Amino acid sequence: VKDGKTLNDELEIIEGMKFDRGYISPYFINTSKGQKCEFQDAYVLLSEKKISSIQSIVPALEIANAHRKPLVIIAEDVDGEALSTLVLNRLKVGLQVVAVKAPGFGDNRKNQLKDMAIATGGAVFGEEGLTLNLEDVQPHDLGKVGEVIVTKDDAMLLKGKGDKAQIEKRIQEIIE
Amino acid sequence: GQAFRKFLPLFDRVLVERSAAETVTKGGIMLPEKSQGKVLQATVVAVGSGSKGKGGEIQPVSVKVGDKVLLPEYGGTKVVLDDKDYFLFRDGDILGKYVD
Amino acid sequence: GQAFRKFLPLFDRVLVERSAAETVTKGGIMLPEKSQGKVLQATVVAVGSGSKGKGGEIQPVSVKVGDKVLLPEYGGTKVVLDDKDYFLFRDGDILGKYVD
Amino acid sequence: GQAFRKFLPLFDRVLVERSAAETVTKGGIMLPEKSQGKVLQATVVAVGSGSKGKGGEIQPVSVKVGDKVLLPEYGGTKVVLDDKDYFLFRDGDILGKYVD
Amino acid sequence: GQAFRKFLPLFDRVLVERSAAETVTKGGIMLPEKSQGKVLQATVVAVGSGSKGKGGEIQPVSVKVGDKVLLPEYGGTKVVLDDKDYFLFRDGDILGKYVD
Amino acid sequence: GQAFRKFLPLFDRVLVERSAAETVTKGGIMLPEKSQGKVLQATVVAVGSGSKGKGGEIQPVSVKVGDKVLLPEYGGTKVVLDDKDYFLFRDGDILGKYVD
């Protein structure tokens, strides 16, 4: 229950996975009518660590470009060389890519990223336990979403192509 | 010694030009210019006469003009010839050659 | 001198490749990658012609291609050949040989 | 040069093993292990061929395998041979030998 | 050696004068004098007799008076001759010559 | 070389023992042990074979066993032989001898 700005009550239903992190740079906007980045049938690359180097972002973009599919990178932060590479490939050749910060502050951020991985059918990179690296990325390690909408203040993933058994198992783990 | 752009290196110095930095990856991904470091591959364009390591004679440099060489990270002097970048090394600074 | 992947070391430099890092212990206990230091065992894959230690002649390097060698902790130069790691040392840097 | 556990030192390097640390005094009092410094007495187990100090010939190392020598505190390189500690010095690092 | 303005450098020292700083660009744009650094191009005006690199004879310097040379950034000594600037280098410091 | 307590110095090293510290003054005044510094007078008890300063032959050490010599303040290595203090120097470190 929150404050409304109108005279009457309204009910809003937030479907899918929506979190309060927008795009990192404003150059990823492709739909100017709402100032948002909208992709359909997009790959999803999830990183538990920050992406700031060239070698940690080239092969994911090579997979996206070879498969001719949009890429959404959800990480702790994309900055520096990797961010400049993303913006340069976006503006010059027209590469369908967007970069979003990972929501949460602490263990909840890791848990939310793992939930996104299970929902989308991808793998979390840069983790402590398993130590999967962004230099070695295969197409099966990337999640698949039917729809993604990224505005300035929030990101939203719709109809992720994960395994239903994985999702039920994660839900039961959350319940326990 | 062999000259180039009317420039002749003295002693055992070798004048090379660095190979062109790679702008796109093998998967067609464009790279930023500021993220491209100094290219350690070069081709030899000028050679000096050579120092006198032994007594009485001039030792020639181990590289000739046209050799593909691998440069070290440090040890090169910037030289501008007809508004174009070139680098001057010592003969012993050069790590190795690419022979074909 | 002997070349390798069309790369020939200059002077007394020796090009080796480090042995593969051990991933499991002798009882089947998996090791983290970031806890694996640089492998000091290597095999020689390329040798330079050799410097001129005495007057008038070339001293050959004390190791040939195919020798198993023990590298020191410091003194190796990173060399990338066909997207693969290799290391360049001076001939006097190598500690010892594994004979068989 | 002489090899040892199929390891041969290069140049004038000498491979030794440090003697066993004394655990009890002469009056039968046990000592803590962490209070035992590096044992400076050693026996020579491997010798290199030797460098070329003069022109044209190889100078042999001044110590042979089986000599007990007195090691300096600093200057030895750790070498692991068949899961056992060994130390690699230069020939001139060695202070002296015990003759019997 | 050859003297200049009643000044003869000793040993392998070379006295040059730096070329005049470029005041206007090729497009007609004048430059501030404080932004013009040291001109590395110079002409050789005096040479020394040379040192004795080998035994018993004097090695002459590799440059002669009138040679256009490229100086390094550091390593010169200011010499004032008849209220005019000149710079004294060692022979090995000069990077190369411009031969026409 | 000459051995002492079954210890032979290698190369040009010289093993001495420091002379006994003076406990009383010449007028019968006793001195604290802490205020007594290292005694720079010593007697030579062991000599090495000597290094090879010139080409082809061994240079003997300038001091023999039994020479009383003056030691420098720094440069001596502690050597324990049969629970007794001894000091190992290089041949050039010793300042002078007292001849009688």
Swiss-Prot record, chain A:
Q: Where are the transmembrane segments?
A: none
Identify residues that carry N6-acetyllysine.
2, 5, 18, 36, 49-50, 69, 92, 114, 152, 159
Q: Where in the cell is it found?
A: Mitochondrion matrix
Sites of N6-succinyllysine modification:
2, 5, 18, 36, 50, 101, 152
Similarity section: Belongs to the chaperonin (HSP60) family.
Subunit record text:
Homoheptamer arranged in a ring structure. The functional units of these chaperonins consist of heptameric rings of the large subunit Hsp60, which function as a back-to-back double ring. Interacts with 2 heptameric Hsp10 rings to form the symmetrical football complex. Interacts with HRAS. Interacts with ATAD3A. Interacts with ETFBKMT and EEF1AKMT3. Interacts with MFHAS1. (Microbial infection) Interacts with hepatitis B virus/HBV protein X.
- Disease per UniProt entry: Spastic paraplegia 13, autosomal dominant: A form of spastic paraplegia, a neurodegenerative disorder characterized by a slow, gradual, progressive weakness and spasticity of the lower limbs. Rate of progression and the severity of symptoms are quite variable. Initial symptoms may include difficulty with balance, weakness and stiffness in the legs, muscle spasms, and dragging the toes when walking. In some forms of the disorder, bladder symptoms (such as incontinence) may appear, or the weakness and stiffness may spread to other parts of the body.
Q: What does this protein do?
A: Chaperonin implicated in mitochondrial protein import and macromolecular assembly. Together with Hsp10, facilitates the correct folding of imported proteins. May also prevent misfolding and promote the refolding and proper assembly of unfolded polypeptides generated under stress conditions in the mitochondrial matrix. The functional units of these chaperonins consist of heptameric rings of the large subunit Hsp60, which function as a back-to-back double ring.
What is this protein identified as? 60 kDa heat shock protein, mitochondrial
- Recorded source organism is Homo sapiens (Human)
Please state which portion of the whole protein this structure contains, as first and last residue out of the total length. 201 to 376 of 573
Swiss-Prot record, chains B, C, D, E, F:
Looking up SUPFAM superfamilies in the UniProt record yields: GroES-like (SSF50129)
Q: Which residues carry this modification: N6-malonyllysine?
A: 38, 52, 54
Q: Which PROSITE patterns match?
A: CHAPERONINS_CPN10
What does the UniProt induction comment state?
Answer: By stress.
Q: Give the sites modified to Phosphothreonine.
A: 77
- Please give the Pfam families that the UniProt record associates with this protein: Cpn10
Name positions with the PTM N6-succinyllysine.
26, 38, 52, 54, 64, 68, 78, 84
Localization of this protein: Mitochondrion matrix
User: Mind listing the UniProt keywords for this protein, alphabetically?
Assistant: Acetylation, Chaperone, Mitochondrion, Phosphoprotein, Stress response
Please name the GO terms of the biological process aspect recorded for this protein, alphabetically: chaperone cofactor-dependent protein refolding; intrinsic apoptotic signaling pathway; osteoblast differentiation; protein folding; response to unfolded protein
Gene Ontology cellular-component terms listed: extracellular exosome; membrane; mitochondrial matrix; mitochondrion
Q: Which molecular function terms from Gene Ontology are attached?
A: ATP binding; metal ion binding; protein folding chaperone; protein-folding chaperone binding; RNA binding; unfolded protein binding
N6-acetyllysine: modified positions: 6, 38, 54, 64, 68, 78, 84, 97
Q: Which Gene3D superfamilies match?
A: GroES chaperonin (2.30.33.40)
Described purpose of this protein according to its UniProt entry: Co-chaperonin implicated in mitochondrial protein import and macromolecular assembly. Together with Hsp60, facilitates the correct folding of imported proteins. May also prevent misfolding and promote the refolding and proper assembly of unfolded polypeptides generated under stress conditions in the mitochondrial matrix. The functional units of these chaperonins consist of heptameric rings of the large subunit Hsp60, which function as a back-to-back double ring.
Listed under subunit, the entry gives: Homoheptamer arranged in a ring structure. 2 heptameric Hsp10 rings interact with a Hsp60 tetradecamer in the structure of a back-to-back double heptameric ring to form the symmetrical football complex.
Protein family according to the UniProt entry:
Belongs to the GroES chaperonin family.
Supply the name of the protein.
10 kDa heat shock protein, mitochondrial
Query: What organism is the protein native to?
Result: Homo sapiens (Human)
Whichever gene encodes this chain, its name is: HSPE1
